[PDB]
Ligand binder design. Sequence first.
Ligand SMILES: *[C@@H]1O[C@H](CO)[C@@H](O[C@@H]2O[C@H](CO)[C@@H](O[C@@H]3O[C@H](CO[C@H]4O[C@H](CO)[C@@H](O)[C@H](O)[C@@H]4O)[C@@H](O)[C@H](O[C@H]4O[C@H](CO)[C@@H](O)[C@H](O)[C@@H]4O)[C@@H]3O)[C@H](O)[C@H]2NC(C)=O)[C@H](O)[C@H]1NC(C)=O
Ligand SMILES: *[C@@H]1O[C@H](CO)[C@@H](O[C@@H]2O[C@H](CO)[C@@H](O[C@@H]3O[C@H](CO[C@H]4O[C@H](CO)[C@@H](O)[C@H](O)[C@@H]4O)[C@@H](O)[C@H](O[C@H]4O[C@H](CO)[C@@H](O)[C@H](O)[C@@H]4O)[C@@H]3O)[C@H](O)[C@H]2NC(C)=O)[C@H](O)[C@H]1NC(C)=O
Ligand SMILES: *[C@@H]1O[C@H](CO)[C@@H](O[C@@H]2O[C@H](CO)[C@@H](O)[C@H](O)[C@H]2NC(C)=O)[C@H](O)[C@H]1NC(C)=O
Ligand SMILES: *[C@@H]1O[C@H](CO)[C@@H](O[C@@H]2O[C@H](CO)[C@@H](O)[C@H](O)[C@H]2NC(C)=O)[C@H](O)[C@H]1NC(C)=O
Ligand SMILES: *[C@@H]1O[C@H](CO)[C@@H](O[C@@H]2O[C@H](CO)[C@@H](O)[C@H](O)[C@H]2NC(C)=O)[C@H](O)[C@H]1NC(C)=O
Ligand SMILES: *[C@@H]1O[C@H](CO)[C@@H](O[C@@H]2O[C@H](CO)[C@@H](O)[C@H](O)[C@H]2NC(C)=O)[C@H](O)[C@H]1NC(C)=O
Ligand SMILES: *[C@@H]1O[C@H](CO)[C@@H](O)[C@H](O)[C@H]1NC(C)=O
Ligand SMILES: *[C@@H]1O[C@H](CO)[C@@H](O)[C@H](O)[C@H]1NC(C)=O
Ligand SMILES: *[C@@H]1O[C@H](CO)[C@@H](O)[C@H](O)[C@H]1NC(C)=O
Ligand SMILES: *[C@@H]1O[C@H](CO)[C@@H](O)[C@H](O)[C@H]1NC(C)=O
Ligand SMILES: *[C@@H]1O[C@H](CO)[C@@H](O)[C@H](O)[C@H]1NC(C)=O
Ligand SMILES: *[C@@H]1O[C@H](CO)[C@@H](O)[C@H](O)[C@H]1NC(C)=O
Ligand SMILES: *[C@@H]1O[C@H](CO)[C@@H](O)[C@H](O)[C@H]1NC(C)=O
Lengths: 436, 429, 439, 134, 130, 136
Amino acid sequence: LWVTVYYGVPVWKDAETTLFCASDAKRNVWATHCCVPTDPNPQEMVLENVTENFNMWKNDMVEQMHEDVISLWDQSLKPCVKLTPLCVTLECRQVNTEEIKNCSFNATTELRDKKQKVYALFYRLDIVPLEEERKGNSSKYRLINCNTSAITQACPKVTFDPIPIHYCAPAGYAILKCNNKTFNGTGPCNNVSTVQCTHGIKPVVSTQLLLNGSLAEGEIIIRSENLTNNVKTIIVHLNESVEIVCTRPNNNTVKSIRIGPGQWFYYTGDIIGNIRQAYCNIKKDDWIRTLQRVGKKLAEHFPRRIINFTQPAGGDLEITTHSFNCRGEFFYCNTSSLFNSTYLDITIPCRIKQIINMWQRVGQAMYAPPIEGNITCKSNITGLLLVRDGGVESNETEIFRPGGGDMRNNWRSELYKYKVVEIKPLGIAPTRCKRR
Amino acid sequence: LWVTVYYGVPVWKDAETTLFCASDARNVWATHCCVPTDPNPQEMVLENVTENFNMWKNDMVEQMHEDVISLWDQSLKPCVKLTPLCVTLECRQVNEIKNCSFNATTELRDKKQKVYALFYRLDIVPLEEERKGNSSKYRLINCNTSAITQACPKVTFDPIPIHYCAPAGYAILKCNNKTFNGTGPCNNVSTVQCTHGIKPVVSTQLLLNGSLAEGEIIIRSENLTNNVKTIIVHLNESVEIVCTRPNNNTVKSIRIGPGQWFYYTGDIIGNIRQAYCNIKKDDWIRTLQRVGKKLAEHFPRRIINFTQPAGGDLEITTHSFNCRGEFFYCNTSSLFNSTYNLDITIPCRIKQIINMWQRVGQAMYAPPIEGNITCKSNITGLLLVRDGETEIFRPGGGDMRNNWRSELYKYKVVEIKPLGIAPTRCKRR
Amino acid sequence: LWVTVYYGVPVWKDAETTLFCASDAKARNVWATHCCVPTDPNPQEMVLENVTENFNMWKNDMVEQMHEDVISLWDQSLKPCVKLTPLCVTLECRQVNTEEIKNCSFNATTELRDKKQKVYALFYRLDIVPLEEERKGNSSKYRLINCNTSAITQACPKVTFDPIPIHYCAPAGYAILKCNNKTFNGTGPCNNVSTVQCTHGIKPVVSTQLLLNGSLAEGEIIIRSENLTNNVKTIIVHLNESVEIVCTRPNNNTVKSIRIGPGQWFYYTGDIIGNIRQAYCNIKKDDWIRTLQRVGKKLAEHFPRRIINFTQPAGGDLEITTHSFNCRGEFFYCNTSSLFNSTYNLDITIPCRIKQIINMWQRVGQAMYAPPIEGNITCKSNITGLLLVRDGGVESNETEIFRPGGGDMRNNWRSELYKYKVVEIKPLGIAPTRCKRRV
Amino acid sequence: LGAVSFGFLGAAGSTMGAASITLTVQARQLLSECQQHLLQDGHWGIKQLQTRVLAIEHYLKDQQLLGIWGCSGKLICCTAVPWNSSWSNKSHDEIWGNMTWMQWDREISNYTNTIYRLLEDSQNQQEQNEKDLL
Amino acid sequence: SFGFLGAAGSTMGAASITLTVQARQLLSECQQHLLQDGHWGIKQLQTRVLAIEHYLKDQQLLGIWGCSGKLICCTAVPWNSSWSNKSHDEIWGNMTWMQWDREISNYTNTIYRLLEDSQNQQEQNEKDLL
Amino acid sequence: GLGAVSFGFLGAAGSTMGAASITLTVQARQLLSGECQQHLLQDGHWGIKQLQTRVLAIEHYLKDQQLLGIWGCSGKLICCTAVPWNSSWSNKSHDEIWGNMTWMQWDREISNYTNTIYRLLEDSQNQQEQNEKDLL
Ligand SMILES: *[C@@H]1O[C@H](CO)[C@@H](O[C@@H]2O[C@H](CO)[C@@H](O[C@@H]3O[C@H](CO[C@H]4O[C@H](CO)[C@@H](O)[C@H](O)[C@@H]4O)[C@@H](O)[C@H](O[C@H]4O[C@H](CO)[C@@H](O)[C@H](O)[C@@H]4O)[C@@H]3O)[C@H](O)[C@H]2NC(C)=O)[C@H](O)[C@H]1NC(C)=O
Ligand SMILES: *[C@@H]1O[C@H](CO)[C@@H](O[C@@H]2O[C@H](CO)[C@@H](O[C@@H]3O[C@H](CO[C@H]4O[C@H](CO)[C@@H](O)[C@H](O)[C@@H]4O)[C@@H](O)[C@H](O[C@H]4O[C@H](CO)[C@@H](O)[C@H](O)[C@@H]4O)[C@@H]3O)[C@H](O)[C@H]2NC(C)=O)[C@H](O)[C@H]1NC(C)=O
Ligand SMILES: *[C@@H]1O[C@H](CO)[C@@H](O[C@@H]2O[C@H](CO)[C@@H](O)[C@H](O)[C@H]2NC(C)=O)[C@H](O)[C@H]1NC(C)=O
Ligand SMILES: *[C@@H]1O[C@H](CO)[C@@H](O[C@@H]2O[C@H](CO)[C@@H](O)[C@H](O)[C@H]2NC(C)=O)[C@H](O)[C@H]1NC(C)=O
Ligand SMILES: *[C@@H]1O[C@H](CO)[C@@H](O[C@@H]2O[C@H](CO)[C@@H](O)[C@H](O)[C@H]2NC(C)=O)[C@H](O)[C@H]1NC(C)=O
Ligand SMILES: *[C@@H]1O[C@H](CO)[C@@H](O[C@@H]2O[C@H](CO)[C@@H](O)[C@H](O)[C@H]2NC(C)=O)[C@H](O)[C@H]1NC(C)=O
Ligand SMILES: *[C@@H]1O[C@H](CO)[C@@H](O)[C@H](O)[C@H]1NC(C)=O
Ligand SMILES: *[C@@H]1O[C@H](CO)[C@@H](O)[C@H](O)[C@H]1NC(C)=O
Ligand SMILES: *[C@@H]1O[C@H](CO)[C@@H](O)[C@H](O)[C@H]1NC(C)=O
Ligand SMILES: *[C@@H]1O[C@H](CO)[C@@H](O)[C@H](O)[C@H]1NC(C)=O
Ligand SMILES: *[C@@H]1O[C@H](CO)[C@@H](O)[C@H](O)[C@H]1NC(C)=O
Ligand SMILES: *[C@@H]1O[C@H](CO)[C@@H](O)[C@H](O)[C@H]1NC(C)=O
Ligand SMILES: *[C@@H]1O[C@H](CO)[C@@H](O)[C@H](O)[C@H]1NC(C)=O
């Protein structure tokens, strides 16, 4: 009958706003930043009888996480030693004991009128030849990416270990979480709740397998923006983890030199014992059951087709191998022996690189210093990134090849259940009471 | 009888603030000036309102000056530095342009490369006596003063119209009185949110683009009888000037460091020719007859002599402009050679190392463009300086504020004061 | 009887806030460039009658803010100045004929990258580290000190670091309380508290053992320490009458300069016109003796039944054993062992060394080069307080040993900020009254 | 700070009546170092200030509207504008008993500006009536 | 507040009538780039913060006088012929708000002090009615 | 500045509450009403520090105004309420509280009950709001 103005109305609208990062209480990164302590025993308020429309794609939380991860990485590397002085001709020979070469070069010193003779072991993947090789007992080589840009040494005192972080809404905004399991990433969610902060998300970097993530509450869930369109990447969320143990079985002796005032350069000096290839061991029975279950779930979406898991097409290691950071070492593992089926460990050969072009940004190379001794780490495989071949012609089959690309499909694997909304407390309604 | 407090009173006070840049919806002017402007923008004429405007002491000009310099420097900052090229050059005759060889750096610190490049004599400073035969040693100009930064070849500075917009709480008053000089009352004032489109064109003697006077030619000066002030002449009709560099340049590039590409002129395919401008002769003559007449009105019982500028540094005696990224220094002495009671060809010099904004150091290097260069400008005004029965007026300039002031002369920024008090007949009770 | 809400209640709570700096409006000076906000003439000060407030000289956030501001201003002032990395070259040095100053030669860079220039310069031995065993009369090889640790930045000769009074001012909503009790020991209650908008003028003078150009005590000499029993803590003797100290570098230097690169000039000492003399300071003898006797008396009162023995600092690096200070841009390191030579409750000449490469605040990795000044240097200061460190331990012969302190710049600034506290105004309060709102 | 507490939500799943009866009961109770790295060490210093500044502007804008409508200082305020069946012809009991605030907000979103203009005019008339009490 | 200046030069009386209705109605990816480029973000924040501070100062001032929530508010302070000796027929006719503002620009503090004293008396009376 | 931000509101500290209140009622209105642009807030972090200070001052001002609004005290400096005083909060007599006692001592004495009192004030206003709705 009459208009009444109400303030505090439980209504919200979709909005894009900056969300601060908060980490659990008690050097590093992901802790120096994200310092804000989280609440102990955080609250979640379930909204009864509330259905909301969620879309894990076009989720601004992913773009913010992407930019924060890149920005923090670059800020961490900024105050570190530049390796521009080392873009010199290298004279490399076979290591006395061809993945690793013994390279001699003339490095700078703190005095600009003096140079020093340095011997170092480098991986072949970090070196580009200038001359035909196998001439005499040595040949001239250049560091990879020297022509493209400067190489910055990561600070050896700062670690990038992916501790969990939480994203929190600023006052006036709220984060809605989708509680319903089996949600495919788009459309309505019939069980939602309101939270202030997200759960703890580990900023783990990988290209084919998703490591140390969350497990599905129920069954394996296949999420893709458009399964028909083979351009889009399919994210597979597992309900059980598969254990993978990776190692670099080489007892390295690490040496360091000064290359300018206060500028220390770290490199591998020698290897004690013989030289062995890095590798990963993935439990065979868990992998086989996992792949059979994924094949089953894909069959439900691609009926009357053979589900063929195959290797990636040949190309640069960055787009064909499983990449990961194991205690600062960068592994590039050849997973063609895993995706070899058609619906006691499996050993995966791995290559190691020290000069890394992260996030497909050409022009900002980083050098990862070596760690003495041998490296071993263990992780939980919690999901997969698959790309459907999508050829128009096939003998009633569908081929699913491992593919990653954007790290942005890794962060979508954790943020798919969250939406950020703005509270709109002012509204009107009819009443029977006149102002008079 | 009783005091009443009103909120929302249409009263304003003169105030300074920070205006934001907007433009009509790469180019540094398009990267900046991010806010889209409205199509068909609002202008609200204030009836029976007289306001005092002053073209000089206008903070919008100082802001535009600072914003242009800041944007320019931010645009050049992430670009290739040419410090590695401060080496001895060995220069020989090609057959004003010399064929100079030098040992440039490479991506490897233990290797150098031999580079042959053509440089203009104005960019080269001798180290020893210059011989007609053999070769002589020289260095790049300004090497002993500052590092030289190469402009990024993929970033263009070509001016586009921009609009300055008031923040909320402020308004811009525009003087709509035609044939209005500065320092005085304006009897036709309208309120706008943003200025009209202004092109940040850089020139030293002629104003090569912009708005034309709605009325007759207007002579504006802070103190016309003071011979140390610059006189800004706004024309009501433009004069077409076509400038060109008739040199079929072949551009080569080398790396001088990791990811650091250096661009230089490699060769000239045809004949070596001097750059020049052609300004329509009849339009220029009518323009100066009209300017001379107005100056005679301002300086009665005097002869008006338009002469060439006095000798001095090239940057302050020639007409400088940016034509597709190339910097022309045209000797406009043939244009100011007359006394008041088809084309005129002006020779031009080209420079690659530019000291902008009258600063010492922070030199910029302009990469060459392949082929020949042409551009066409509409001369809209003149910057004249009086020497102080014959008055002598010479081209002059170089203080960039005068170019931007020539567009902002009609705008004032004011602050809205919504409170006011007046007597009423009604008591609070 | 009924709750009544009052807004504007004269109540405050301790709070931290960023303060802003202000200075005299009437004027290169880094401190004048910063602290640009003019202060008021005849500033407001109000006395709070019958107000007792607990002050604590230690754990005063105004000191931490002043410390960070001083460091930030120094680091910013050197940001655009010439870097001396190109001068880390083998340097060949011989003794100057008519140990402390050597005639060194080196091949410096030039405007062009393919040319070098031969440069001769005089350097102090304290700025040079040998590379090979030295030989008298021969061109031994040396390098500049701190070259291996980090880059050396030349201070800009146009930039002036001379201390001026500055004032720290509270932002709106906060007030600075000042203790006006002339005998306040730095902690505990103060029964005469006034409120100010800004502190008095404080000169950011940098010194290691003696406090120069500070305020004088209103009363007698005041001995302040966080804990006198704990001999680890530094004591800050404030003095009620200054002692005049005159310092000089009696060397008529000729200063030369070269270019290092485009637009980058390097300044160095070219020659000495006259003889070579050691720098020195002179402190009036009678004023020093009376001052030290009065300090000994106060310490004896604080440490009864003990002999107060003042001795020299234990041996170590000059930065922690000598009285360092900046005299018109040059850095003096004066040996004060001849002053702290008393036993118990005409001038005195102090030898001084001079250095050009300074590691300010003992921060390893950020060295600066102090350009030379032509002619000879004189300056004079007022000694207003001492930094003393007690050596207890065994307490041999029932004595206490006091030595010069220093090494932590916050003790110098605390010596001026000890009387100020920053509080937040809390204007909203509740009290019972006899009035109720109508239903 | 405004109506920004999380406890303002949860009533979204209740009907307008049931949620309304929570206002004036809970609404007032709901209304009620490492910082040198997050700030002054990157562009985060600006992003955080923009968020804080933006939140203030939104708060003030909502308060301004309450001022304009004559609703300042209240959580529920009745006006003198009659309800038009053109905006919504659902019965009072149907709106309050069988709808949530979210669905209601959607149903009349296209008339919100119209209603707001009427509120302004109503207050305008009331202000004149106060002046006319002379 | 841009449209408020449309009433400029309206003899005040007309301007007052115009504001009576119009003032209430008047009161009611690339852009982010420059916020991280140089110091443009700081200048924009200074502009927004200053605008907020001036708005709040005006609202505080209206609150002090007891005019909060109103657009036009009558007080209990009588007009003094010293401040202006013009009649109400001249002030509200053949005179604009700019001219009036100049006319009493130097009496603002006297009027404000009287308004503050009047509000103190009113608030007291309100306390006394209880 | 904004709000009760002046030394005139800080003076009278140490003075009896009754006298400070009397001063308040005749001074608060008068007190409430009352190349740095190139070096500072450019090329340094003074910009952020001052903006944080100004924004924080604004937030504190608005917070206090919100509290006065919620309690129904908007536009007043001394607002009477309808919440009875509980002897469990303070058992001192009216004269002892208003005489021979300063605002600092009073604030310390009831600090532990401040939030309880605030909750009651909020509840009181809700009852008053219902009465306004009912008497129509
Ligand atoms: C998925 O999650 C797992 C579990 O977190 C990750 O694997 C762990 O990774 C961390 C960090 O890379 C490993 O921690 C490192 O262990 C080294 C060996 O530890 C031995 O010695 C310590 C001595 O205290 C014993 O406590 C320990 O039990 C072992 O006996 C340490 O030497 C490392 O310390 C070094 O780095 C830290 C970094 O801050 C420095 O502070 C130290 O001073 C020192 O320099 C480090 O603590 C951990 O061992 C791994 N666990 C397992 C089971 O492998 C996976 O990496 C993750 N997945 C991905 C893809 O990242
Ligand atoms: C404790 O406080 C005292 C007093 O404030 C300080 O001593 C003063 O320090 C300043 C700065 O070092 C001295 O000022 C300098 O004086 C030089 C000239 O001195 C004589 O010579 C000229 C003739 O050449 C006479 O006209 C003059 O009156 C003096 O008799 C100046 O040349 C210096 O100028 C340099 O710096 C300025 C800075 O702006 C530049 O503009 C100049 O171009 C030039 O580079 C300088 O002004 C002052 O003389 C000292 N006073 C006394 C009595 O000695 C103490 O230093 C201070 N204690 C500490 C520890 O700092
Ligand atoms: C909707 O989701 C919520 C949260 O996921 C469910 O509530 C949980 O229920 C389990 C019991 O199965 C409890 O152990 C948890 O503690 C509950 N969590 C919370 C936050 O309440 C709720 O049961 C779901 N409802 C439906 C119908 O799916
Ligand atoms: C610009 O126009 C103004 C008039 O609006 C001129 O100002 C005055 O003009 C009268 C003649 O009408 C002179 O007697 C005064 O001396 C002028 N005053 C000043 C301060 O100059 C003004 O002279 C004009 N300026 C120019 C350069 O033409
Ligand atoms: C050192 O102390 C002396 C006094 O002991 C100061 O000399 C006085 O300074 C004031 C200026 O503040 C003059 O008005 C007096 O006339 C001076 N008296 C004498 C005897 O010189 C001196 O200024 C102090 N120096 C410093 C740097 O603080
Ligand atoms: C500074 O303090 C000392 C004491 O610490 C004062 O010295 C006293 O001066 C009186 C003057 O008549 C003598 O009778 C005392 O014997 C002195 N005491 C000592 C221990 O020597 C000195 O006068 C004070 N000076 C100022 C300016 O306050
Ligand atoms: C998926 O992509 C195909 C491309 O062939 C398109 O035709 C189809 O409509 C897309 N599906 C959706 C739901 O957009
Ligand atoms: C790695 O080093 C550890 C050190 O204890 C050793 O136990 C382990 O066997 C090593 N692994 C390999 C593959 O050498
Ligand atoms: C300062 O005086 C107080 C007495 O008010 C005393 O408790 C405290 O210990 C003294 N501190 C020092 C350092 O003398
Ligand atoms: C001062 O130091 C002594 C050292 O023995 C210690 O016992 C005493 O507790 C300290 N004083 C305070 C107040 O902590
Ligand atoms: C009014 O009721 C009719 C049903 O007769 C319905 O179609 C229409 O949408 C209603 N209008 C509104 C504004 O709810
Ligand atoms: C103005 O008011 C004062 C008192 O506030 C009075 O004394 C004075 O006479 C008044 N002016 C005139 C012209 O009456
Ligand atoms: C302080 O106490 C004295 C004596 O009790 C009294 O006269 C004086 O007025 C008090 N201070 C104030 C501000 O009232």
